[PDB]
Amino acid sequence: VFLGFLGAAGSTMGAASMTLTVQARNLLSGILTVWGIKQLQARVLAVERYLRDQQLLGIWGCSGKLICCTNVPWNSSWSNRNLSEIWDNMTWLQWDKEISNYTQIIYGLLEESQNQQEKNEQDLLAL
Amino acid sequence: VFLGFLGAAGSTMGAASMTLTVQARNLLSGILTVWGIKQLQARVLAVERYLRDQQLLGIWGCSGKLICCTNVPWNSSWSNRNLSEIWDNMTWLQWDKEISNYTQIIYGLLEESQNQQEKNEQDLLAL
Amino acid sequence: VQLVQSGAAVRKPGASVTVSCKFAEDDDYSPYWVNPAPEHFIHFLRQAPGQQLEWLAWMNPTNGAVNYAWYLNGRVTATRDRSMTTAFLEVKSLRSDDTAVYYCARAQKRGRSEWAYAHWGQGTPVVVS
Amino acid sequence: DIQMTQSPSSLSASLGDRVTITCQASRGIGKDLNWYQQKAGKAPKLLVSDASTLEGGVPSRFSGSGFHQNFSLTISSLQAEDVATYFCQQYETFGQGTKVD
Amino acid sequence: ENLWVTVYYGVPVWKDAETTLFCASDKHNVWATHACVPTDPNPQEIHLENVTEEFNMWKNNMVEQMHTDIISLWDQSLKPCVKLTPLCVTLQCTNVTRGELKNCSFNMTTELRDKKQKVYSLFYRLDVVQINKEYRLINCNTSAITQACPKVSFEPIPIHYCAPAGFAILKCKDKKFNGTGPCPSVSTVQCTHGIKPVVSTQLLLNGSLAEEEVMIRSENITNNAKNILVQFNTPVQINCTRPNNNTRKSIRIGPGQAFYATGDIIGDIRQAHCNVSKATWNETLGKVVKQLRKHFGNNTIIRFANSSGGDLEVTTHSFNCGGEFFYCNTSGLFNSTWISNNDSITLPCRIKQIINMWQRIGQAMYAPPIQGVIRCVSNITGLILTRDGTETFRPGGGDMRDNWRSELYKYKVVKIEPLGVAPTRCKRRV
Amino acid sequence: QGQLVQSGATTTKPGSSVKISCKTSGYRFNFYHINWIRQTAGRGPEWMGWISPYSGDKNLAPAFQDRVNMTTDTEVPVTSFTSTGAAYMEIRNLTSDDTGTYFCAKGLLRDGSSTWLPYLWGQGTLLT
Ligand SMILES: *[C@@H]1O[C@H](CO)[C@@H](O[C@@H]2O[C@H](CO)[C@@H](O[C@@H]3O[C@H](CO[C@H]4O[C@H](CO)[C@@H](O)[C@H](O[C@H]5O[C@H](CO)[C@@H](O)[C@H](O)[C@@H]5O)[C@@H]4O)[C@@H](O)[C@H](O[C@H]4O[C@H](CO)[C@@H](O)[C@H](O)[C@@H]4O)[C@@H]3O)[C@H](O)[C@H]2NC(C)=O)[C@H](O)[C@H]1NC(C)=O
Ligand SMILES: *[C@@H]1O[C@H](CO)[C@@H](O[C@@H]2O[C@H](CO)[C@@H](O[C@@H]3O[C@H](CO[C@H]4O[C@H](CO)[C@@H](O)[C@H](O)[C@@H]4O)[C@@H](O)[C@H](O[C@H]4O[C@H](CO)[C@@H](O)[C@H](O)[C@@H]4O)[C@@H]3O)[C@H](O)[C@H]2NC(C)=O)[C@H](O)[C@H]1NC(C)=O
Ligand SMILES: *[C@@H]1O[C@H](CO)[C@@H](O[C@@H]2O[C@H](CO)[C@@H](O[C@@H]3O[C@H](CO[C@H]4O[C@H](CO)[C@@H](O)[C@H](O)[C@@H]4O)[C@@H](O)[C@H](O)[C@@H]3O)[C@H](O)[C@H]2NC(C)=O)[C@H](O)[C@H]1NC(C)=O
Ligand SMILES: *[C@@H]1O[C@H](CO)[C@@H](O[C@@H]2O[C@H](CO)[C@@H](O)[C@H](O)[C@H]2NC(C)=O)[C@H](O)[C@H]1NC(C)=O
Ligand SMILES: *[C@@H]1O[C@H](CO)[C@@H](O[C@@H]2O[C@H](CO)[C@@H](O)[C@H](O)[C@H]2NC(C)=O)[C@H](O)[C@H]1NC(C)=O
Ligand SMILES: *[C@@H]1O[C@H](CO)[C@@H](O[C@@H]2O[C@H](CO)[C@@H](O)[C@H](O)[C@H]2NC(C)=O)[C@H](O)[C@H]1NC(C)=O
Ligand SMILES: *[C@@H]1O[C@H](CO)[C@@H](O[C@@H]2O[C@H](CO)[C@@H](O)[C@H](O)[C@H]2NC(C)=O)[C@H](O)[C@H]1NC(C)=O
Ligand SMILES: *[C@@H]1O[C@H](CO)[C@@H](O[C@@H]2O[C@H](CO)[C@@H](O)[C@H](O)[C@H]2NC(C)=O)[C@H](O)[C@H]1NC(C)=O
Ligand SMILES: *[C@@H]1O[C@H](CO)[C@@H](O)[C@H](O)[C@H]1NC(C)=O
Ligand SMILES: *[C@@H]1O[C@H](CO)[C@@H](O)[C@H](O)[C@H]1NC(C)=O
């Protein structure tokens, strides 16, 4: 099936996670007059917001990945939910709300876990 | 030899394929007055067209690659030409014309072949 | 749209005649916000009774440039008024064979076929005798 | 300098017949030919421009084709209102005309 | 066989597109060349071996883009300048001690709004119309009028059009390349050569010559309604001068508003004119008449006549010399009939001041008078003929984009599309 | 993927020279060599030589080096990837041993190990 842009918004986190490229395509293209400056401001805004998400993927060792596995172990303080009660029960919309507070913390952990990982790889290849 | 920007435009697809970084460098740098707004419109246009090619490479698992090998098998309906009659006979200009129609189809195949590849890698590392 | 021409005329051999042709309907309106494309030439043609259609000259209403037919021998002049809404065709040294119905034709502004006369006038019968 | 040979000079057909008129050029003119229809006591009306482009408002029964030197104007299923004189146009030179009856 | 598609990023392939170009250059001139990016001292020209591209100078969008850029820069360079609408008042004019230039006195507003002043100024005939005799500036009943700022220069400065990143320009190295067709030798450049935006009529001035032979270009040369763009290979020199020693006189017409009027002539009253070498113009007309036979016949006779009508701008060699807009009679250059098989020509040029520049009806410009004696030297490197619908060719023009087309034929804008998919016996791992 | 038409059957006598044409179309002439090959009565087929329209280079067998005049014009471009060329061939000391059918052949590929291989042939010309 082909649900469309945000088609799986109401589907479960597991279902939507197979339709990632759907939302990844339309993030950069889409699904001195008044309109002239109004459009230019939007064309620059789209690029800035895109490169910010790409910037975070880059410093997490996830550049080029849609599904990216990391080294940060899941702190149960963030959410003490079982695996089967998340990917087959919740929607990404609900999940983003429940992890609203802890999102900024995870973003830092994913960063130093990458600068230490490549610092280690620089030593693994020092022989 | 150093042919220059588009130097191998008339050379064979194999010859030009060794001079990829030549064309890759000058894709982003180059080889309220009237000119002021005329130049700003061009500086934004160059970035948008660049990130679109990078966006496609990213969702094909080719981000960072110049020569990228995939999993989509070559449908002979697209072109029933032999390997030696392409890379040592044709020029990329001719090739882009002969594959004009089927180009949009290949671009979709290269996308899901990557979202299924990483979905599989997420399972290979689930143990 | 049809072009408006002047009424019929009768002239002696050796006299002159002026055939007007209102090709536009403006007065003091033309500047826009975007740069407009060039205008199409106003062509003048005649057809003698029972003869073929004969091209005489075209006249650029923007700057007044003209291209008169060879066989006219400089006996024809084509101008336009200040408002550039009315063309004029003057034929000097009239002779008997100049008796014909005189038309003005213009291509369509949307099209780029300068000779595809989409617009025509009702004709002006000129008789020299 | 160019010479347009239109043939035939006159023809007659019944209501519903297929009528074709040809214009031959003494040398290559690309697709720069226009077809007109002129009735008695009226100004011509543009039928086909650029050899093969039907003008807007002209009934679909008309059609034109040609390139280089051989051109043609066709009326599929003749009608009563089609009685007029048809002539091709190459720049300032016209064909000698065809009187349909 | 075992063939999988593989992605290639950076493949020499392009498409015909049209993008927004930007300028590059090397007092402020009207063409704001100071606002352009500096022309790079190392101009990279890459030659495309084996490549053969189709060109069509008559569809080129660079021309249509340049033409509105100049118009756009012209309008930009007149906003801050003074408006001469208070000059649209009744003039009392007398001849000057034939009858071309006048001597006109009017009541004018001072810097105080309740005081007048009876000032006088000289005006060329072409700038006034009747009603001491009572006159009036020509523009008053059609358009407002704006005095050109006397610090901007009308000097053509070499401008280079550059394409953005990811686009390119394709030159045409073919020494005998006419208008359209497939250019055998092609190269790619980032910007065009130094194009001088010379606004001219009939005679293409100071432009770029043709190598080898003299070329002739046209869409349909069999179409009489298409201007012939003939390009010389050897320049014929033309010398123009207004010899009157004019003087400029400031007239305060308001707070901060000064109208520069023509004061008086210091010395002899003479005619403005242009000289061309009659010998060099004879041999150049011959080179033209030669290539004219290749399209019309070795036996037919080629005749040159003067214009047949129109406005002053198109019936005369219209141009600009040291800041003043000349309008030269050319009947002395196109008066020859050619069969199958010290010298100087002098042209009577008039001078105007109320000029509408392009074809805009609503935006007139007063060119302030230039002090001193004006003389300029320039090459006529091209021509704009028009055959009569014996094949006779007469000069003409008007549409300023033919001027730009005479220098932009060599170039074409293409869009680089570097993604290429092609099969090989390659596959990635698991 | 085009035609390589040749001249007619011009039958002379020993001592003289014969010039055979080969006018190309439907393909970029300067991108492939032009091979010359003959099949005479008395032997089988014999490869004479090829010439590179692009580089102007010529390579021919020692059995015909001092006999063959091999020259090419310059292509007149038709489209981006099409042109029209012409290849010429002459023979010096002509005899009756050299009587046979002669052809021109377009090279096979633009690179690799079979660049000049006679792939696309003409129709043949009958000599003395
Ligand atoms: C533009 O387009 C033209 C025409 O398509 C291209 O010209 C072709 O280039 C290819 C590759 O560059 C050529 O194929 C090669 O051919 C050589 C054979 O040459 C040898 O023999 C010749 C005769 O004895 C001799 O002249 C050569 O000597 C050198 O000097 C001459 C002087 O005239 C010079 O012109 C030559 O180029 C030579 O450099 C030489 O001794 C052959 O050896 C090659 O095969 C080797 O390499 C390949 C890999 O490339 C390998 O697979 C083989 O196994 C072998 O190792 C190769 O086949 C072709 O002959 C040219 N001409 C044609 C097709 O008509 C040109 O390259 C294009 N340029 C651009 C920039 O696009
Ligand atoms: C365009 O038209 C304008 C007119 O609108 C001309 O301007 C006038 O030009 C004339 C000359 O052509 C000027 O007349 C001269 O005025 C001089 C100034 O003297 C005045 O002031 C003194 C006080 O110092 C008084 O005594 C005197 O009466 C004047 O009122 C005089 O010096 C000149 O005298 C000369 O002529 C007389 C008689 O001909 C001789 O006897 C003298 O010896 C002497 O040679 C002369 O009278 C006039 O002033 C100008 N008007 C203005 C407002 O400036 C422009 O010249 C004209 N330009 C062109 C190019 O055609
Ligand atoms: C075609 O091109 C010609 C040359 O490229 C143009 O000639 C130029 O015309 C302008 C104005 O008409 C001249 O500028 C003037 O210069 C004089 C003084 O110049 C002299 O002094 C300077 C000292 O700085 C010296 O360097 C020069 O060489 C001269 O000796 C000023 O008094 C004026 O105010 C004005 O600035 C150019 O000098 C002149 N160039 C040449 C080489 O003659 C010609 O105008 C062009 N034609 C058209 C129709 O555009
Ligand atoms: C006017 O010019 C056009 C384009 O330059 C000519 O059109 C070409 O004509 C030739 C010969 O008839 C054809 O082989 C081409 O295919 C045509 N190309 C296009 C794009 O139409 C046209 O023939 C010219 N007309 C005249 C009267 O000279
Ligand atoms: C400037 O001189 C010319 C030339 O003498 C004058 O032109 C004359 O104008 C009158 C009208 O008032 C005509 O009747 C004459 O036929 C004209 N003569 C010529 C030779 O054309 C002109 O009037 C003078 N202007 C002023 C302001 O004195
Ligand atoms: C007018 O004449 C020639 C153009 O042919 C120019 O003079 C030559 O300019 C070239 C390059 O600028 C030099 O290599 C030659 O040495 C010059 N010749 C001489 C005799 O000086 C001249 O600059 C042109 N003027 C323009 C275009 O304004
Ligand atoms: C043109 O006229 C001006 C004055 O109207 C002349 O300028 C004078 O030049 C001399 C030097 O030759 C100076 O001593 C004067 O002071 C200048 N006068 C002014 C008012 O500035 C100029 O020489 C004349 N030029 C020509 C070619 O006639
Ligand atoms: C145009 O003007 C130029 C320069 O003002 C003239 O060139 C001069 O010609 C004479 C005679 O041959 C030479 O002695 C000078 O040396 C030349 N000047 C320069 C700067 O080289 C030219 O003759 C004039 N031509 C016309 C047609 O008026
Ligand atoms: C969970 O997070 C808290 C603070 O938010 C931290 O103190 C604790 O060590 C974390 N536990 C694990 C297992 O990471
Ligand atoms: C985040 O902090 C706010 C503080 O007002 C709290 O109300 C909210 O419950 C917190 N989020 C979660 C998921 O506990």
Ligand SMILES: *[C@@H]1O[C@H](CO)[C@@H](O)[C@H](O)[C@H]1NC(C)=O
């Ligand atoms: C080739 O493409 C067609 C449709 O374009 C498809 O039906 C067919 O299955 C494809 N074949 C292979 C081998 O991929």
Ligand SMILES: *[C@@H]1O[C@H](CO)[C@@H](O)[C@H](O)[C@H]1NC(C)=O
């Ligand atoms: C692509 O489709 C068009 C349809 O008009 C067709 O003419 C063309 O041949 C197709 N491309 C290829 C490579 O077959």
Ligand SMILES: *[C@@H]1O[C@H](CO)[C@@H](O)[C@H](O)[C@H]1NC(C)=O
């Ligand atoms: C200026 O105004 C006065 C007021 O009566 C008038 O007499 C005079 O003629 C005017 N001057 C001009 C040049 O119009």
Ligand SMILES: *[C@@H]1O[C@H](CO)[C@@H](O)[C@H](O)[C@H]1NC(C)=O
């Ligand atoms: C402006 O005045 C001139 C006088 O020369 C007249 O011929 C013309 O018709 C007028 N034009 C307009 C638009 O009023």
Ligand SMILES: *[C@@H]1O[C@H](CO)[C@@H](O)[C@H](O)[C@H]1NC(C)=O
């Ligand atoms: C330019 O040259 C080509 C080939 O020589 C020719 O087909 C074309 O008609 C020429 N252009 C003109 C305007 O004659």
Ligand SMILES: *[C@@H]1O[C@H](CO)[C@@H](O)[C@H](O)[C@H]1NC(C)=O
């Ligand atoms: C052209 O020449 C004729 C006769 O030589 C002349 O009457 C006419 O005024 C001239 N036209 C121009 C614009 O010089």
Ligand SMILES: *[C@@H]1O[C@H](CO)[C@@H](O)[C@H](O)[C@H]1NC(C)=O
């Ligand atoms: C141009 O000059 C000729 C004679 O040299 C003259 O007959 C003609 O009238 C002039 N042009 C104009 C527009 O006056």
